[PDB]
């Protein structure tokens, strides 16, 4: 009756790239028809319609993983809610990502990342800049029913710039993933299996690749940090320049 | 609401809610003419003022909106009508 | 130390620094500790499980306590 | 305590969307053509509060 | 008072949560990560001028690190003696440790 | 009908006792590779075709209808080389019908591994054996030395124009790896965690290339279903299942073995007449785990008149997986025993995604806390929501062969887990 | 087992370590097997060609000579040897019993099995003898399942020329005592079931299906 | 409407920099995008030699990150003109949605 819906742009600004302008698959994100190109998961299907879907282990720059599945939207007609980071929209299909599965299953998740997860947050360098924190406090459930013994992990040597402790981190693989595809050292692993998973090199071996300071930025938990920045400050005391850089000519 | 069945249309000229207290997001200047109903009227007797909450949205173009409260002690309703007025 | 040089001019009493390392590390049966703070869970820091499969003792970060496998 | 599903408890954002639906003067003429009468109950009801004197009766002074 | 473990070693680590949650933004915290390795705050500075005195720092913070002793007795002749010190008067809570031990011990149930 | 007498001129995996000799010069005689260079001269589409028709179903866990499985293959070869892996590795709890073939007449899944491959338009079959198959994968090593030194495999498939080539790789000592899209990466080189399913293992499989990972009794019964009829075969069963799938009924029963039979026997059939009883007699069954591992209990009220067949054991709420039936009596700990398949589920999962390397770990703790008595009455539908909040998330199904025996074990004994609490409390004070 | 590497004089990557021969044929064969590119498919059997030959684990200085071999950076190879659970990296002894213990076996007495095994040889679970011979370590469905309790001997005596992976299944207390006395004293106890009146796999009292003398069926 | 805003006049020649916060590359969540907000550089930050804390002297030290943030480069530049700033509006950098899939990591390097 003559609404006003929002605008119900990107979730970022984000321009879109089409391909060509034939190959646009039409699908619906809440009911709410959005043009993507050919081959956009579901997840940028939904960047698209300005959802924002809880991703920890999808980077954009980075390869497509299921290593955590916090996205699960549910998609019409499948019988589990499928992984939006690497579900392909398909045309007409029809993304529900606020439906009361999609709901349970990112709560669902974000209790098992909560689980052996230690309450490093307070003594994590990234406490206030947490994507798990700040999912847990907008997607994740405000409790947790895991009383028993978490598993803890040593903290690695990964040289003078990551300060690592692994026992925070959720192993999403975004990491073993930089390492081996963006900074192309191939150092760091996701060695063992089960909870058991430990990301870091299998022997002591300090990030010799330079580019790979941008791990912390990649990972979404304090566990890889910088050491630098060891503790010196905190995610909201810091007031924020877009600067520029001027150490290489790259800039 | 019977408030907004008997008020002329053009005084609650750019919004209405419904809940959180019910406003009539008005023009400046139906407002007083506004004020003017809703008090002196039968079935709408405010006759308190309660307070004028002047808000500032800068990213409007009408920059303030002078939130007016109004408190009605006989049918024990409150009503917010409110504007829109830059800096000058 | 020179970090405890920085909030501390009395350099009459020991720094808690040393008075951290100066405590032994407390030997443990499993794999993992709780470390819940001093003895009430809830007068401590949050918990903090400790591994322990290195050979050296795996301080706490939030007490400076440490704990060793003792197998 | 063992049954941690939160968007069903949800407050802070468990709440219809917002609609907000422009009225033309098509609607308001329509709208004012249908109100034919203003019938009583179609009247804001009045708060009745009378006063009336009591010195301790309200319990025998004793709450 | 910065409370401390039973064991020496300040019970602050830097969170800067008190930082955070003080209305009257009087506790100032600068981190390093000390030689020990383990987090601490190189600047703990409470202002007592600048504090409303209202336990929300007694609250937020994670490990009881920060919590107001029931002294109420430090009226001073001058104004920067109220502005308390980074960790070294606020460290003066080990001589009221005894009362505010005390008072946590029976206070926890609530 | 009634189901389950099946002759022994009707079971396809003679030798399955090893009795006589696996290799060539003991597999001819056994009919294996007997005219196989006709059956690759009928084609690839007829192959598919009698398969479809035979309605033979997935002898693994998936229980997908194979043929139709073979027939998601590309038919125009766009440079990538169709493969065929062969999912040798079990690492199933209970199932040992694979390790009955691997070794013990190899030969059929070899001549398998060729007929699947003219079916798929395969190029080469990467047999996986399971990592701890040591002997079984030289015994097949030594049948597939043989089926190359008999012109059978490699540049003439069994003298006809097909170039079938089959390698055996072998995993180590991993479940996960066994799973269909973790098969194909296991073998890739990389870790054995499973792959999403949007890529399909038809469309991107092993190496990018297409490729169907087969269970070795349905590839190894593929040889036998074309020789002998597939009306033949589909006349065993019940309407949708059918065929003769290879039981292996584990323990607690006076006498375990793993037999071939009929498909839809019924299951107190099956344990009278095979593998002797029920230890202690039926009356004395507590509870019975009628596939692998990854399926629901039966709680001896429903294992009466239940069908070993997909369709039915579907129905029962519960799964015929590898048909490798588990019993358990009334002496067995029942919650001990779904506790030890929980910490094998924590064990044998490659931690890839987050709701079962997580949840796995954490359905292992209640089991060890509700098999002492440690829990609360409310902490049972905690562990049912845990293992639905596992069940759909997971990437592969073996979140579901993890939240499975627990959903299975509440459902059923729910009675056993609060009676344990129950008497934990009153030990207490 | 812990997922990284303590160096050690025996287990460091400064070692020089690579294929001996009668094992640089195997390795040139099982890279033939996979493609000229992805040949990093041989790294399960290259790694546990190792493992023979290394008798019975895995120094970082091997799987740093697998990748050589294998043409990946190391952590890789690293990544797949502290996944899979076969492969040792860590001493395990000359023999290595893996009693499963899996509820198939579980059930079957499994436990008692290795707590036998355990108090027999003395070590806690994984731990090697003093003797360097033995070690128990625990290992999920073995597959041997109808076969109810077993007990896998990894003989790792000689290396990729001895190394048998035997199945001792249908066994006992005694039964695995006497397999493990038998093994110390040098010789190879015969493996599959250990238990006669039943055929490999079969039903304890003679197999009752499989009669009748295998012949072509009608085709 | 600079005039009339009481502002002094040495901070009405101010020179601001109206741009859109860009997304804090450590968490990956677009939800403090598209807020655009005037910069008052307001650089100069000493330290109090009393005690170790810091000490402005701008009174436009927070405001222009704490509490002023319009929702459209055309309202900040709006009102950057009015109050009569010397704006220099820096455009915000967005990201190209680039397609990709699963199946592209396993790929098939052909032979
Ligand atoms: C949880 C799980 C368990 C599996 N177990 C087995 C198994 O025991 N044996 C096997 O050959 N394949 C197993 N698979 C792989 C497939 O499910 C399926 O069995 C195989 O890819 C094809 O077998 P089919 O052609 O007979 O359906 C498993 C997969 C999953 C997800
Ligand atoms: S990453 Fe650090 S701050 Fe975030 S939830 Fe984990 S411990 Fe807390
Ligand atoms: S270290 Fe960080 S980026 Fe790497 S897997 Fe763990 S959480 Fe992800
Ligand atoms: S009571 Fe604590 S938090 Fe509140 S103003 Fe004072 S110091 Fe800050
Ligand atoms: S006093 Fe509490 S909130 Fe403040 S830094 Fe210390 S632990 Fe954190
Ligand atoms: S976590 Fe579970 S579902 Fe995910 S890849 Fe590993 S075994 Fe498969
Ligand atoms: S990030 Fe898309 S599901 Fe893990
Ligand atoms: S019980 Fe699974 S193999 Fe022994
Ligand atoms: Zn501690």
């Known amino acids: 009756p003559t609404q006003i819906l929002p605008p119900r742009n990107p979730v970022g600004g984000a321009r879109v790239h089409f391909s060509n302008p034939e190959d646009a698959i039409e699908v619906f994100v809440d009911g709410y028809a959005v043009k993507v190109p050919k081959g956009f998961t579901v997840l940028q299907a939904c960047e698209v319609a300005g959802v924002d879907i809880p991703r920890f282990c999808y980077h954009s720059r980075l390869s497509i993983a299921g290593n955590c599945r916090m996205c699960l939207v549910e998609v019409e007609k499948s019988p589990k809610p499928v992984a939006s980071c690497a579900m392909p929209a398909l045309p007409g299909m029809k993304i529900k990502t606020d439906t009361p599965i999609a709901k349970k299953a990112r709560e669902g998740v974000m209790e098992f990342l909560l689980m052996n997860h230690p309450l490093d947050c307070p003594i994590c360098d990234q406490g206030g800049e947490c994507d798990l924190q700040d999912q847990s406090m907008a997607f994740g459930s405000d409790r947790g029913r895991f009383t028993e013994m978490k598993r803890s992990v040593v903290d690695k040597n990964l040289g003078p710039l990551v300060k690592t402790v692994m026992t925070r981190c959720i192993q999403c693989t975004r990491c073993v993933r930089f390492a081996s595809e963006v900074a192309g050292v191939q150092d760091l692993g996701i060695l063992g299996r089960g909870s058991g998973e430990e990301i870091g090199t299998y022997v002591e071996k300090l990030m010799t690749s330079e580019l790979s300071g941008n791990v912390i930025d990649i990972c979404p938990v304090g566990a890889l940090t910088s050491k630098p920045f060891a503790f010196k400050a905190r995610n909201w005391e810091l007031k924020a320049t877009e600067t520029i850089d001027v150490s290489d000519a790259v800039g | 609401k019977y408030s907004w069945e008997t008020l002329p249309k053009k005084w609650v000229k750019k919004m209405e809610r419904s809940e959180h207290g019910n406003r009539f997001d008005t023009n400046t200047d139906y407002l007083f003419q506004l004020l003017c109903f809703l008090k002196l009227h039968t079935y709408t007797r405010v006759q308190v003022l309660i307070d004028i909450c002047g808000v500032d949205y800068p990213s409007r173009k009408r920059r303030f909106e002078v939130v007016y409260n109004l408190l009605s002690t006989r049918y024990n309703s409150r009503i917010r009508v409110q504007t829109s007025a830059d800096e000058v | 130390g020179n970090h405890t040089a920085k909030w501390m001019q009395d350099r009459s009493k020991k720094s808690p620094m040393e008075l951290i390392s100066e405590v032994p590390p407390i030997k443990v049966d499993g794999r993992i500790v709780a470390c819940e703070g001093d003895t009430n869970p809830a007068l401590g820091h949050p918990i903090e499980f400790i591994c322990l499969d290195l050979n050296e003792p795996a301080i706490c970060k939030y007490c400076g306590l440490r704990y060793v496998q003792d197998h | ?63 | 008072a910065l409370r401390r473990y039973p064991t020496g070693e300040e019970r602050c680590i830097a969170c800067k949560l008190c930082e955070a949650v003080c209305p009257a933004q009087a506790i100032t915290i600068e981190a390093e990560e000390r030689e020990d390795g383990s987090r601490r705050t190189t600047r703990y500075d409470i202002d007592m001028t600048k504090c409303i005195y209202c336990g929300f720092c007694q609250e937020a913070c994670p490990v009881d690190a920060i919590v107001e002793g029931p002294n109420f007795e430090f009226a001073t002749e001058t104004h920067e003696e109220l502005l308390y010190d980074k960790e070294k008067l606020l460290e003066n809570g080990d001589r009221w440790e005894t009362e505010i031990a005390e008072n946590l011990r029976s206070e926890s149930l609530y | 009908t009634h189901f389950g007498g099946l002759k022994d001129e009707d079971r396809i995996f003679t030798n399955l006792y090893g009795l006589h000799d696996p290799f060539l010069k003991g597999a001819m005689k056994r009919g294996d590779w007997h005219r196989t260079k006709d059956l690759v001269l009928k084609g690839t589409d007829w192959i598919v075709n009698e398969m479809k028709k035979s309605g033979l179903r997935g002898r693994g866990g998936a229980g997908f209808p194979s043929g139709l499985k073979w027939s998601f293959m590309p038919k125009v070869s766009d440079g990538r080389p169709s493969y065929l892996v062969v999912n040798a590795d079990e690492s199933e709890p209970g199932t040992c019908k694979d390790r009955e073939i691997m070794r013990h007449d190899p030969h059929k899944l070899l001549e398998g591994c060729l007929i699947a491959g003219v079916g798929m338009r395969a190029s080469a079959a990467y047999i996986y054996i399971r990592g701890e198959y040591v002997n079984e994968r030289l015994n097949l090593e030594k049948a597939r030395r043989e089926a190359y030194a008999a012109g059978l495999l490699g540049k003439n498939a069994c003298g006809s124009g097909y170039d079938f080539e089959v390698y055996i790789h072998f995993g180590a000592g991993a479940y996960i790896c066994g799973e269909e899209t973790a098969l194909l990466e296991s073998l890739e080189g990389k870790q054995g965690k499973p792959r999403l399913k949007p890529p399909f293992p038809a469309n991107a499989g092993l190496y990018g290339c297409p490729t169907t990972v087969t269970n070795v009794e349905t590839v190894a019964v593929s040889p036998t279903i074309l020789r002998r009829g597939p009306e033949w075969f589909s006349s065993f069963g019940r309407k949708n299942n059918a065929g003769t799938k290879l039981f292996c009924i584990s323990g607690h029963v006076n006498k375990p073995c793993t037999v071939e039979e009929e498909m839809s026997i019924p299951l107190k059939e099956l344990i009278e007449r095979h593998c002797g009883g029920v230890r202690g007699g039926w009356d004395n069954l507590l509870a019975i785990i009628p596939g692998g591992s990854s399926v629901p209990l039966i709680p001896k009220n429903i294992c009466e008149d239940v069908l070993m067949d997909f369709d039915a054991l579907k129905a029962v709420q519960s799964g015929l997986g590898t048909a490798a039936v588990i019993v358990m009596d009334k002496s067995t700990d029942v919650v001990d025993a779904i506790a030890r398949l929980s910490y094998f589920y924590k064990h044998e999962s490659c931690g890839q995604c987050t709701p079962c390397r997580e949840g796995t770990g954490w359905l292992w703790m209640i089991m060890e806390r509700m098999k002492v008595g440690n829990a609360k009455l409310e902490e049972i539908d905690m562990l049912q929501e845990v293992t639905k909040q596992i069940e759909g998330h997971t990437i592969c199904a073996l979140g579901d062969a993890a939240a499975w025996p627990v959903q299975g074990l509440i459902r059923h004994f729910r009675p056993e887990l609060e009676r344990r609490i129950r008497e934990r409390a009153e030990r207490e004070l | 087992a812990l997922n990284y590497h303590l160096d050690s004089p025996d287990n460091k990557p400064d070692l020089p370590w690579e294929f001996s021969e009668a094992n640089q044929s195997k390795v040139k064969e099982i890279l033939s097997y996979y493609p000229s590119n992805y040949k990093q498919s041989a790294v399960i059997p290259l790694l546990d060609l190792a493992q023979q030959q290394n008798g019975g684990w895995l120094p970082v200085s091997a799987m740093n000579a697998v990748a050589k071999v294998i043409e990946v950076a190391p952590i890789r190879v690293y990544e797949v040897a502290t996944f899979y659970s076969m492969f040792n990296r860590a001493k395990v002894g000359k023999y290595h019993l893996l009693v499963c213990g899996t509820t198939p076996c579980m059930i079957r007495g499994s436990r008692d099995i290795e707590s036998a095994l355990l108090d027999h040889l003395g070590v806690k679970r994984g731990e090697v003898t003093k003797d360097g011979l033995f070690s128990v370590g625990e290992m999920e469905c073995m597959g041997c399942c109808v076969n109810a309790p077993m007990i896998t001997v990894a003989d790792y005596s000689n290396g990729s020329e001895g190394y048998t992976y035997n199945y001792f299944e249908d066994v006992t207390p005694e039964k695995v005592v006497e397999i493990v006395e038998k093994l110390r004293k040098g010789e190879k106890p015969p493996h599959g079931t250990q238990n006669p009146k039943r055929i490999k796999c079969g039903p304890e009292g003679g197999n009752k299906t499989l009669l009748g003398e295998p012949k072509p069926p009608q085709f | 409407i600079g005039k009339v805003s009481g502002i002094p006049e040495e901070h009405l020649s101010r020179k601001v920099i109206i741009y859109s916060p860009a997304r804090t590359a450590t968490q990956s969540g677009s939800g403090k995008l598209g807020k655009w907000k005037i910069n008052f550089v307001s650089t100069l930050k000493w330290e109090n030699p009393l005690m170790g804390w810091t000490s402005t002297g701008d009174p436009y030290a927070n405001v222009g990150d704490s509490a002023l943030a319009f929702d459209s480069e055309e309202a900040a530049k709006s009102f950057a003109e009015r109050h009569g700033w010397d704006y220099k509006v820096k455009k915000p950098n967005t990201p190209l949605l680039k397609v990709k899939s699963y199946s592209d990591n396993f790929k098939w390097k052909g032979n």
């Open chain 4, 1 to 63: 305590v063992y049954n941690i599903v939160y968007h069903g408890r949800d407050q802070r954002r468990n709440r219809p969307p917002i609609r907000r639906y422009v009225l033309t003067k098509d609607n308001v003429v329509q709208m004012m053509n249908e109100k034919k009468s203003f019938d009583v109950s179609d009247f804001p009801k009045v708060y009745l509060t009378t006063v009336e004197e009591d010195l301790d009766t309200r319990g025998g002074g004793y709450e």
